[PDB]
Every structure is written in structure tokens, then in C-alpha cells.
Design a protein around this ligand. Structure first.
Ligand SMILES: *[C@@H]1O[C@H](CO)[C@@H](O[C@@H]2O[C@H](CO)[C@@H](O[C@@H]3O[C@H](CO)[C@@H](O)[C@H](O)[C@@H]3O)[C@H](O)[C@H]2NC(C)=O)[C@H](O)[C@H]1NC(C)=O
Ligand SMILES: *[C@@H]1O[C@H](CO)[C@@H](O[C@@H]2O[C@H](CO)[C@@H](O[C@@H]3O[C@H](CO)[C@@H](O)[C@H](O)[C@@H]3O)[C@H](O)[C@H]2NC(C)=O)[C@H](O)[C@H]1NC(C)=O
Ligand SMILES: *[C@@H]1O[C@H](CO)[C@@H](O[C@@H]2O[C@H](CO)[C@@H](O[C@@H]3O[C@H](CO)[C@@H](O)[C@H](O)[C@@H]3O)[C@H](O)[C@H]2NC(C)=O)[C@H](O)[C@H]1NC(C)=O
Ligand SMILES: *[C@@H]1O[C@H](CO)[C@@H](O[C@@H]2O[C@H](CO)[C@@H](O)[C@H](O)[C@H]2NC(C)=O)[C@H](O)[C@H]1NC(C)=O
Ligand SMILES: *[C@@H]1O[C@H](CO)[C@@H](O[C@@H]2O[C@H](CO)[C@@H](O)[C@H](O)[C@H]2NC(C)=O)[C@H](O)[C@H]1NC(C)=O
Ligand SMILES: *[C@@H]1O[C@H](CO)[C@@H](O[C@@H]2O[C@H](CO)[C@@H](O)[C@H](O)[C@H]2NC(C)=O)[C@H](O)[C@H]1NC(C)=O
Ligand code: NAG
Lengths: 124, 614
């Protein structure tokens, strides 16, 4: 994250995959740096929670945005609207563990074709 | 497949005692006292004590109703305020001579308490029944009180995402692991202690999603499991966890017919006065294409004990390289045996408890709770397979016939409030009778047998009330032939009293009594008058109880054909003479014919003397 104190943007180095999950080495593999503002992170997690709690993970208009991950015998629900405000961090009655169908998308700011990024530090 | 119930008793034609409290529903928990004279009923928001000899006699009552602030709390959690947000009694167990251990769902706050029997008032112990009692009245649940410690199988939470087989001990609390190898979406059916160096065991029966099998949809599989009473958990690993938990497939099928019943519904332990080994009578239905079918498989405890004691375990393996498959483990098994009890052998190797077992053995059982061998039924086939019936609960009474031949009497309840009485005759099922216990066709949720001298009864609970039935209705049988033909080990014909009596109940002489399970009514020793107007029509009423017999009419010593215009059959049994004239007068005989073995048994049902006026 940006530091000079602790920003609101997550800077993440990604590398393309080799055929255990090893990044393709040398000039055959590339790396990229993506920025995911943490508010964008929270916006999506919040809408994943909201869908899964109140509108069966479907979320109007269309649909199939949230589900229960890791094969847990739970399902998304049609709970009252008030659940969102009453239980922000959930409860014994809310669906868990939740996960998004919709991914959090970022376009690179850095795209290095022959380099395999291993460490990130950002300042301002 | 098993035939149709030989005789059908309407709720109207038999003596059945009923019990229900106005505005009180879901009579799902039944428990009778030590003395067997007081049956306790656990319903929705109430507990009663009724005279077990006449369930209609209400002795004591106690309520445990939910507060409006607790109902609204539950409703705010999107549950049904007037349905699910109420106190469903789920745990009704003996605690002492002067108390019972009671747990209810309680608008999804499982709560436990002690019912003071001398007062029939709750003690307000207000214990958190999380793990002991389900939150949801929909969730599966099972409990057995062993040495004043509750052994329970249910959900550990509100959503029913966490299953649990645990012991609320206080001294040594133990529970299962929250892992697929241990339990994979189970639906609890039954639990009991199988008592004896050798330790006692606490068996558990349930249906869960199979790991060993793969099909179009996820396949369910019945499970027999056990834990050791003396379990104290592991020291370094399995801290506060079962070290004695082993499970296996419970197989109920006829393969030459492609019939597989992979959903367990009920389990009854036949505790033989004679036989040293108990027999589990298990009730199953198929997961796939149930339309519906029911099967009753009987399992010898020794068989299951053989699997848990000497059977090879199953290994889980990684397969290409994101999948898990389960195969027979043929590798080295640790000693002491993983999952075994603290027996004579262990004590010799200076092992006093699970707390001092090697980590090698404890790790093994934790990673291998499932056995490769299936637990198979006696004679490797079901005792009964029935079609067009969804059986709900089962009870079995081991009864000695006049002959001395022992029959295991199967009382099986249906999802339409009926009870079937069946016995496995010579290599074929005989369904003696069926009785409509509930006039409202309410499914029998719970069933409980008292085979004790004097108080011989079956007690069935549904959402609408409770019913009390005897084990036989010998008196309903009119003739000796009718008494014998029933092929009920409970019923014998008494020539001195001219009544069909209940053998092993009545004070009639044993040596001078008639019973033949062959159905040969040959062992037995051996006129409604009408006057109708000319031209008029006659209805000659005739009826019998065998659903397996057909009736035909006879006039002037010949088999009359009930065809238009002169004759007609009303309701397939009542004869209709249409145009009365001089020649129609005389004797009309209604006769029945029923096949027993190869032979046919003709009986004269009705005798009529019809006289046509001029
Ligand atoms: C994701 O959803 C959560 C709620 O489930 C959002 O949290 C709520 O966000 C508001 C927005 O600021 C918070 O209000 C503010 O709190 C600060 C703290 O003192 C106060 O100074 C402001 O005047 C205002 O009242 C609210 O407290 C917070 N509630 C919780 C439980 O966290 C979150 O903001 C959402 N994030 C995104 C990106 O949508
Ligand atoms: C349930 O399973 C147990 C486990 O074996 C069965 O018990 C055993 O049955 C065998 C079969 O005969 C008995 O062996 C022998 O019986 C004959 C009959 O008189 C006798 O002459 C031989 O000398 C020998 O004893 C074995 O002893 C017996 N053991 C026990 C503990 O019962 C049991 O019969 C099975 N029950 C059902 C309903 O399947
Ligand atoms: C406890 O016993 C009561 C007594 O019968 C059971 O009541 C019944 O509950 C079912 C629903 O679970 C009612 O069925 C209906 O379902 C449709 C489908 O959506 C719904 O639209 C209707 O409004 C209604 O809920 C049934 O009519 C009702 N019986 C009576 C006489 O009201 C109760 O379900 C039992 N609870 C348990 C856990 O067994
Ligand atoms: C169980 O219920 C009985 C019924 O009242 C309770 O009995 C009373 O006990 C007190 C002493 O604690 C006596 O002084 C009273 O005379 C008893 N009354 C009767 C009618 O027996 C008993 O105490 C209750 N047990 C518990 C643990 O509360
Ligand atoms: C369920 O577990 C609780 C947890 O301890 C048991 O509670 C103890 O019960 C004994 C009497 O049996 C009391 O003397 C202790 O003071 C209680 N301690 C606590 C923390 O509650 C309870 O008895 C267990 N119930 C059953 C049926 O096994
Ligand atoms: C046996 O039980 C099954 C359910 O296990 C019954 O099937 C249901 O019947 C109702 C009645 O219309 C249908 O609405 C359901 O869709 C059926 N469900 C399934 C899975 O088939 C069956 O009718 C019962 N039959 C008997 C003879 O008891
Ligand atoms: C007990 O059963 C008998 C038999 O008819 C009945 O007369 C009596 O009223 C019943 N007792 C109660 C309390 O219902």
C-alpha cells in the first residue's frame, strides 16, 4: 500500500503462469503492476454481501454475482433489508463463507515482458 | 415385494386411545417411565405426563412457551414468527428417578433444562443447548442419555452448516471434527449404547453424502458409527475430540432387482430375551426415483463389530492433482488399533485412557474415520421390501408362537398415519393387518414399543396428537378359521370361550388352544331372513375383512353370475336381484376364496333366506 502514511490503494505485482503455481521464467514470462483502490475492494465485497444476504446472490437486474464458497452447506438468502445495517459483520443466521462471481478488474500501469516480480514497496 | 396388508382396520373399528392438547402440536418426543405406567410426551412448547395404560388420562402438564421479544428476534432473522420461531422439544431423556433432561429449539436459541418430576415444573437451569439440540425444527437430531451424560447427533449451528456428534460430559467433553472425512452433510436418525475389560459403545446411525461413490448427482449413503463410552480424547492432537469414531456403509439392497435403499429413516434395537447379541432393525427408502418404496433390513451387531474391529480402513488420495478419491487402504495399520476402545490388550501395554494413546494411532483414526467394508444385513437381503408405501418409523417385538417358533414382529408406521404388522413367514413377508392410527392421515413422526407384561402397547406421535394401540386385535376375529387364517403369532382360538384370544395375555389353557401359522384352518371343528314384495329389488349385504380374498355368490347350490338384467353387484360384495318373482325365493350364499400356500380356502361369509311375497 502507498506509504509516507498508509494509503487507500493496493499495488499488486502479478506474473503470467508457466504450465506448484510457478510463474513462467525468463523472457517467456512477463510481469504487471496493478492498482486496486481499497474502496473499490470494499464496494464489491459489500455488494457481494448485500446480494448474498438479501437477494439470493443474484443482485438485480441480472444476476448470479455471489455464492457460498469451499463447498459449505450454506446458501445465499432472501433475508430482510434491515439485515445489512443490523448485521454488517454478519451473524449465526447470515450465509457464510461468501465469494464473488464478478471479479475485481484492474488494467496494468507497468507491463514488463521479461521480468518476474517478487517484491513491491510504494512511497509518495 | 411384500403383499398388501391382509386386513385393514378403520380408526372406527378398533379400540385406539388418543391424546392431544388443544392448540398444542408436533408431538415428536416420546418417553416412558421406569415403571412403564407413565408415558411422557414432548410437544411444541409443552411437556405432559399421561397414563400409559390410557393415554387420554392427562396426569401432569408443563409449558415452555416463547416470549414475544424472542419470537420477534427470530422473525427479524427472516424465520417464520408463527411456525419456526417456537419451542420444539427435541431432547426428552431420563435424568434420575425424580427428573428428566429437556431441550427445545426455542426460536433458534437451543435451550436445555431439568424437568422436576415431583412438581412437573422446570428448574430454570437454562443451559445453552448449542450442540445438544438443533436450532431449526427442520434439522435432523438424535440423542441417547448414557450414565447421565448426553450423547447427541445434530447441527452445531443456526444454518445447519456445521454437523456434530458430541458428548456434553462436563468432566470430559468430546466432539467430532468439522471435516468431510468425519461427517459429510449428515441427517441423524438414531443413537443408543450397546453395553458389554471390554468398554461399552455408543452407536450412531445417519445418512450423509458419500465420498467413496460418484454418480450424476451427489449420492447419499446410510452409516453405522460408534464411539467408546470411556473416550477422553487425545492429549497432543484430538484435544477434546473423539478418538474412537469409526463409521461404515449400511447396505440395504436386492441387486438381482437393481433395488438400492440408500436413505436411512429409523433404527430399532431388538434386545432379545433369548439371543445374547442385539439385532438392529433398520428402515430405509431409496434416494433415487422414490415413488415410494420402503425396505426393512435387519443387521446382526457381531457383523458391524467385525468391520470396526478387523476391517481394512479407507484412504483418501490426490488424483490429477485437484481431485480426491477414496480407496481401500492396504498399508500398515498402527498398534494399538486406531478407533478401538481401551480394552484388555491396551491395558497390558500400559494404556489406561485415550489420553495416553500414541500420536501415531490418534493421527491415523483422525485421517481414516471410514471403513472399506460395508455392514451387510442378516441373510444378505432385506426382511421386507414394499411398494406404494412410505414407511416412517419401526419397532420389533420378539414373540413366541403356540408352537414355540419365534417370530420377530415388525410394526411399521406410514406417512399417512397407518401401522402395518409384518412377519417374515417361510421365506415370504406376511403383513398380518394395517390400522389407521390417525383419522387425519398425519405422518407418524415417532414410534415407541412397550412389550412388558400387562402394558403391551405401541405409542405413535404425529403433529396432531399421540395414539395408543395394542399389539393385536385377536377379538376382532369371529370364527376359528378366521382366527387361524390371520397367521398372527399373538392370536390363538379358544374352543371353551368361543373367542379368538391373545396367546401370552389371556388366562386360557395353552394345551387346549388352536394356532397354525401354516394357515390350515383344518385344525378347527366346523341365516338372515328377508321378505320382499313381488317385482321389487333385493340387496343382500355381505362383507369380510381379507383384502386378499374375493367374494362370489351362490343361489340354489350353484355359482350365480352377477350380470344384467336379473343380477348386479353393488360394491363388488353386495348381491342385487332385480325383478323378484316366485322362482327367486330361497337360499342365497355369499362365499369367500383366499389362497394361503397352493390351496384355496373357501368360507361362507353370509347366509340369506329370501322370500318373495305375492
Ligand atoms: C462497506 O459497507 C460498510 C457497512 O457494512 C460501510 O461502512 C460504513 O461506512 C460508513 C461510511 O463512512 C461509516 O460512516 C462514517 O463513520 C465515520 C467513523 O467515525 C464517521 O466519522 C462518519 O461521519 C460516518 O458516520 C459507517 O460507520 C460504516 N459502518 C461500518 C459497520 O463499518 C463501508 O463504508 C462500505 N465501503 C464501501 C467502499 O462501500
Ligand atoms: C449373529 O452373529 C453371531 C456371530 O457369529 C451369530 O453367532 C454364532 O453363530 C454360530 C453359527 O452356528 C455359532 O456356531 C455354532 O453353533 C452350532 C449350533 O448349535 C453349535 O453346534 C456349534 O458348536 C457352534 O456353537 C456360534 O457359537 C454363535 N456365537 C454366538 C456368540 O452367538 C448369531 O447366531 C447371529 N444371529 C443372527 C440372528 O444371525
Ligand atoms: C407442527 O405441527 C403443525 C400442525 O399441522 C404443522 O403445521 C403445518 O405447516 C405447514 C407448513 O410447514 C402448512 O402448509 C402450508 O404450506 C404452504 C406452502 O407454501 C403455505 O403457503 C401455507 O401457508 C402453509 O404454510 C400446513 O397447512 C400447517 N398445518 C396447519 C393445520 O396449519 C407444522 O408444520 C409442524 N412443524 C414441524 C416442524 O413439523
Ligand atoms: C423437586 O420438586 C419437589 C416438589 O415440591 C421439591 O420439594 C420440596 O423440597 C423442599 C426442600 O427443598 C421441601 O421443604 C418441601 O416440603 C418439598 N415439597 C414437596 C411437595 O415435596 C424439590 O425440592 C424439588 N427439587 C429441586 C432440585 O428443586
Ligand atoms: C452439560 O454440560 C454442562 C457443562 O458443565 C454440565 O454442567 C455442570 O452440571 C453439574 C451437575 O451435573 C454441576 O454440578 C456443575 O456445576 C455444572 N457446571 C456447569 C459449567 O454448568 C451439565 O450437567 C451437562 N449436562 C448433561 C445432561 O450431561
Ligand atoms: C411417497 O413419498 C413420496 C415423497 O418422498 C411422494 O412423492 C411426492 O408426492 C407429492 C404428491 O403430489 C408430489 O407433489 C411430490 O412432488 C412428490 N415428490 C417426489 C420426490 O416424488 C409419493 O407420492 C408418496 N407415495 C406413496 C405411495 O406414499
Ligand atoms: C380411560 O379409558 C376409559 C375407557 O372407555 C374411558 O371411559 C375413560 O374416560 C378414560 N379416562 C380418561 C381420563 O379419559
Amino acid at each position: 500500500v502507498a506509504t509516507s502514511a498508509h494509503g487507500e490503494v493496493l499495488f499488486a505485482a502479478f506474473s503470467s503462469a508457466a504450465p506448484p503455481p510457478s510463474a513462467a521464467a525468463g523472457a517467456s514470462g512477463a510481469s504487471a503492476l496493478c492498482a486496486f483502490p481499497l474502496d473499490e475492494v470494499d464496494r464489491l465485497a459489500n455488494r457481494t454481501r448485500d446480494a448474498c444476504y438479501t437477494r439470493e446472490g443474484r443482485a438485480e437486474d441480472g444476476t448470479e454475482v455471489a455464492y457460498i464458497e469451499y463447498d459449505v452447506n450454506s446458501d445465499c438468502a432472501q433475508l430482510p433489508v434491515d439485515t445489512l445495517d443490523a448485521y454488517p459483520c454478519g451473524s449465526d443466521h447470515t450465509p457464510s463463507p461468501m465469494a464473488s462471481r464478478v471479479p475485481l478488474e484492474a488494467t496494468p500501469i507497468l507491463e514488463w515482458p521479461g521480468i518476474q516480480l517478487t517484491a513491491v514497496a510504494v512511497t509518495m | 415385494f411384500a403383499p398388501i396388508p391382509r386386513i385393514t382396520w378403520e380408526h372406527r373399528e378398533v379400540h385406539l386411545v388418543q391424546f392431544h392438547e388443544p392448540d398444542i402440536y408436533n408431538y415428536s418426543a416420546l418417553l416412558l417411565s421406569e415403571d412403564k405406567d407413565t408415558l411422557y410426551i414432548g410437544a411444541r412448547e409443552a411437556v405432559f405426563a399421561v397414563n400409559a395404560l390410557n393415554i387420554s388420562e392427562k396426569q401432569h402438564e408443563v409449558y415452555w412457551k416463547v416470549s414475544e421479544d424472542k419470537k420477534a428476534k427470530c422473525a427479524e432473522k427472516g424465520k417464520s414468527k408463527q411456525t419456526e420461531c417456537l419451542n420444539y422439544i427435541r431432547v426428552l431423556q431420563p435424568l434420575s428417578a425424580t427428573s428428566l433432561y429437556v431441550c427445545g429449539t426455542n426460536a433458534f436459541q437451543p435451550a436445555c433444562d431439568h424437568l422436576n418430576l415431583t412438581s412437573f415444573k422446570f428448574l430454570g437451569k437454562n443451559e445453552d443447548g448449542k450442540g445438544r439440540c438443533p436450532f431449526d425444527p427442520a434439522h435432523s437430531y438424535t440423542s441417547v442419555m448414557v450414565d447421565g451424560e448426553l450423547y447427541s447427533g445434530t447441527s452445531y449451528n443456526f444454518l445447519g452448516s456445521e454437523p456434530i456428534i458430541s458428548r456434553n460430559s462436563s468432566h470430559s467433553p468430546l466432539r467430532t471434527e468439522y471435516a468431510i472425512p468425519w461427517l459429510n452433510e449428515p441427517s441423524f436418525v438414531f443413537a443408543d449404547v450397546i453395553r458389554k475389560g471390554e468398554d461399552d459403545r455408543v452407536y450412531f446411525f445417519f445418512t450423509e453424502v458419500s465420498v467413496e461413490y460418484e454418480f450424476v448427482f451427489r449420492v447419499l449413503i446410510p452409516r453405522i458409527a460408534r464411539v467408546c463410552k470411556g473416550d477422553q480424547g487425545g492429549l497432543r492432537t484430538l484435544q477434546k475430540k473423539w478418538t474412537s469414531f469409526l463409521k461404515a456403509r449400511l447396505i440395504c439392497s436386492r441387486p438381482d432387482s437393481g433395488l438400492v435403499f440408500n436413505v436411512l429413516r429409523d433404527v430399532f434395537v431388538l434386545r432379545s430375551p433369548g439371543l445374547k447379541v442385539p439385532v438392529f432393525y433398520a428402515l430405509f427408502t431409496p434416494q433415487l426415483n422414490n415413488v415410494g418404496l420402503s425396505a426393512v433390513c435387519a443387521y446382526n451387531l457381531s457383523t458391524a463389530e467385525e468391520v470396526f474391529s478387523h476391517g481394512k480402513y479407507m484412504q483418501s488420495t490426490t488424483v490429477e492433482q485437484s481431485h480426491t478419491k477414496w480407496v481401500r487402504y492396504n498399508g500398515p495399520v498402527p498398534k494399538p488399533r486406531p478407533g478401538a476402545c481401551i480394552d484388555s490388550e491396551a491395558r497390558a501395554a500400559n494404556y489406561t485412557s485415550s489420553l495416553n494413546l500414541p500420536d501415531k494411532t490418534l493421527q491415523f483414526v483422525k485421517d481414516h474415520p471410514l471403513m472399506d467394508d460395508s455392514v451387510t444385513p442378516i441373510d444378505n437381503r432385506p426382511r421386507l421390501i414394499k411398494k406404494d408405501v412410505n414407511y416412517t418409523q419401526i419397532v420389533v417385538d420378539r414373540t413366541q408362537a403356540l408352537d414355540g417358533t419365534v417370530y420377530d414382529v415388525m410394526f411399521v408406521s406410514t406417512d399417512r398415519g397407518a401401522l402395518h404388522k409384518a412377519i417374515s413367514l417361510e421365506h415370504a413377508v406376511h403383513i398380518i393387518e394395517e390400522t389407521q392410527l390417525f383419522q387425519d392421515f398425519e405422518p407418524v413422526q415417532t414410534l415407541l414399543l412397550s412389550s412388558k407384561k400387562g402394558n403391551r402397547f405401541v405409542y405413535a406421535g404425529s403433529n396432531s396428537g399421540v395414539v395408543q394401540a395394542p399389539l393385536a386385535f385377536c377379538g376382532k376375529h369371529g370364527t376359528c378359521e378366521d382366527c387361524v387364517l390371520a397367521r398372527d403369532p399373538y392370536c390363538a382360538w379358544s374352543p371353551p370361550t368361543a373367542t379368538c384370544v391373545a396367546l401370552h395375555q389371556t388366562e386360557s389353557p395353552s394345551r387346549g388352544l388352536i394356532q397354525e401359522m401354516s394357515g390350515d384352518a383344518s385344525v378347527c371343528p366346523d341365516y338372515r331372513q328377508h321378505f320382499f314384495k313381488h317385482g321389487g329389488t333385493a340387496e343382500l349385504k355381505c362383507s369380510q375383512k381379507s383384502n386378499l380374498a374375493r367374494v362370489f355368490w351362490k343361489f340354489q347350490n350353484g355359482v350365480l353370475k352377477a350380470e344384467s338384467p336379473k343380477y348386479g353387484l353393488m360394491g363388488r360384495k353386495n348381491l342385487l336381484i332385480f325383478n323378484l318373482s316366485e322362482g327367486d325365493s330361497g337360499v342365497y350364499q355369499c362365499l369367500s376364496e383366499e389362497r394361503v400356500k397352493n390351496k384355496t380356502v373357501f368360507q361362507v361369509v353370509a347366509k340369506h333366506v329370501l322370500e318373495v311375497k305375492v
